Amino acid sequence: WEMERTDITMKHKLGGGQYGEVYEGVWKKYSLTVAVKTLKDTMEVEEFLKEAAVMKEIKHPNLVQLLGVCTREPPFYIITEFMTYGNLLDYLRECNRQEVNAVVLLYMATQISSAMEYLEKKNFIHRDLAARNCLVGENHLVKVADFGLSRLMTGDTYTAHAGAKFPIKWTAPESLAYNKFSIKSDVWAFGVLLWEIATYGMSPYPGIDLSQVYELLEKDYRMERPEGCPEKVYELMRACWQWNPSDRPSFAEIHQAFETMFQ
Numbered sequence: 557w558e559m560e561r562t563d564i565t566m567k568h569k570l571g572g573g574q575y576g577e578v579y580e581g582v583w584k585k586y587s588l589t590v591a592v593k594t595l596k597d598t599m600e601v602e603e604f605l606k607e608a609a610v611m612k613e614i615k616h617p618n619l620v621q622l623l624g625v626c627t628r629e630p631p632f633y634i635i636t637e638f639m640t641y642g643n644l645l646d647y648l649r650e651c652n653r654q655e656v657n658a659v660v661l662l663y664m665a666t667q668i669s670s671a672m673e674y675l676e677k678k679n680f681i682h683r684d685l686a687a688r689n690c691l692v693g694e695n696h697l698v699k700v701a702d703f704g705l706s707r708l709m710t711g712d713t714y715t716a717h718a719g720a721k722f723p724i725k726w727t728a729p730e731s732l733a734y735n736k737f738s739i740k741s742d743v744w745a746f747g748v749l750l751w752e753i754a755t756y757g758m759s760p761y762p763g764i765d766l767s768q769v770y771e772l773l774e775k776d777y778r779m780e781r782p783e784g785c786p787e788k789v790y791e792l793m794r795a796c797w798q799w800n801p802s803d804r805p806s807f808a809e810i811h812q813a814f815e816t817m818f819q
């Protein structure tokens with residue numbers, strides 16, 4: 557995975573510095589546009605290296621693709637493919653809804669649940685599954701990613717919980733209550749991500765304050781079916797949001813339900 561900082565031209569920051577220390581670059585060797593995550597320097601060197609190691613272990617059509625890293629000498633790089641249409645959240649808000657119709661929404665959900673079915677089998681845990689962490693390429697190709705948005709991001713999307721920031725409105729109750737993350741809380745976050753897709757990137761639990769979200773989920777409040785969302789997709793959302801993690805379907809299951817539907 558190692559490669560020459562001589563094979564890479566660092567150009568502008570991607571998405572106007574929304575992704576933090578991540579740069580648009582060219583992989584000279586192949587006249588290729590890449591994304592390069594850099595490191596400041598900060599005492600974040602530990603988690604940056606776990607990250608590269610993890611990425612080495614995973615490969616799937618629907619996971620953002622590692623291409624190389626630069627971790628002998630600073631500056632420390634990690635290098636992936638570059639996705640033309642950018643993050644999914646903005647893509648949905650900005651799209652031609654006649655192009656990105658019902659069938660496309662469904663295709664988008666399918667691909668993500670295939671990426672997740674994969675991490676599941678490899679016993680990985682994403683931990684921050686959301687449209688903002690997905691990328692779109694040509695022909696509505698969607699890849700799941702993880703950009704480390706907790707400390708970058710600008711607003712009430714992430715809120716503080718003991719030196720950590722959690723996106724409350726994506727977070728499974730057991731994770732809010734007991735700090736318990738598992739593939740099942742990924743399943744919960746996928747149900748919220750389903751709702752983002754169906755509302756074309758609306759914010760979840762609109763206007764509901766953060767501090768009442770847990771209490772509402774406990775009293776069994778769930779977000780309504782969006783306008784135009786197939787009932788079986790919504791029933792699936794409803795299963796991802798089962799109170800008990802073990803009552804939640806698996807991404808194997810979800811992917812199968814989504815693969816059938818794709819008709």
Ligand SMILES: Cc1ccc(NC(=O)c2ccc(CN3CCN(C)CC3)cc2)cc1Nc1nccc(-c2cccnc2)n1
Nearest residue numbers: 575578591592593620634636638639642681682683701702
């Ligand atoms: C340049 C880079 C460096 C690292 C990563 N890392 C990941 O995307 C990633 C994905 C999955 C995991 C798996 N991991 C398992 C353990 N749990 C806890 C967390 C997730 C980890 C990192 C992506 C990128 N890609 C990236 N980053 C930011 C922006 C963009 C981008 C933006 C616009 C157009 N094209 C690309 N592309």
